[PDB]
Amino acid sequence: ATRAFSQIKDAMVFAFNLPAIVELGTATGFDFELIDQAGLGHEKLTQARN
Amino acid sequence: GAAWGGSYVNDFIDRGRVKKVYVMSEAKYRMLPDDIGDWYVRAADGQMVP
């Protein structure tokens, strides 16, 4: 399904299976939070994220 | 009440944080009892009643 939908234009369509434990969700990688600690603002935080 | 004790009007945004807005009399106009004579109230006809 993902291979077939990769041809779809003007949309990102991605098919995937359920996690074993949906309550915990995925455990595949890492979850990282970038925090604005000095009141930089949304734009500066966006630049830092980029 | 607003002149002599302060009044919390609403919130504003200081460096991305919600903070209060207060309206109060300047210090020197709410110090002594005689300062009560400095304040006027508008009447329905627009006159200033002490």
Query: What Rg of chain A do the Cα atoms give?
Result: 17 Å
What overall geometry of chain A do the principal axes of the alpha carbons give?
Answer: flat
What class, by secondary structure content of chain A?
A: mainly alpha
Oligomeric state of this protein: part of a larger assembly
- Individual helix count of chain A: 2
The greatest interface here is: A-B, 3 and 3 residues
Give the helix level of chain A as a range of percent. 10-25%
Distance between the termini of chain A: 31 Å
| Range of strand content of chain A | under 5%
The H/E string of chain A reads HH
How many strand elements of chain A?
0
Largest sheet of chain A: none
Please tell me about this protein's structure:
Chain B: This is Multidrug efflux pump subunit AcrB. Chain B: It is found in: Cell inner membrane. Chain B: Homotrimer, with large domains that extend into the periplasm, interacts with AcrA and TolC. AcrA may be required to stably link this protein and TolC. Interacts with AcrZ. Part of the AcrA-AcrB-AcrZ-TolC efflux pump. Chain B: AcrA-AcrB-AcrZ-TolC is a drug efflux protein complex with broad substrate specificity that uses the proton motive force to export substrates. This is part of a larger assembly, with two copies of chain A (50 residues). By secondary structure, chain A is mainly α. The first copy, chain A, is built from two helices and no strands. The A-B interface holds A 36, 39, 41 and B 15-17.
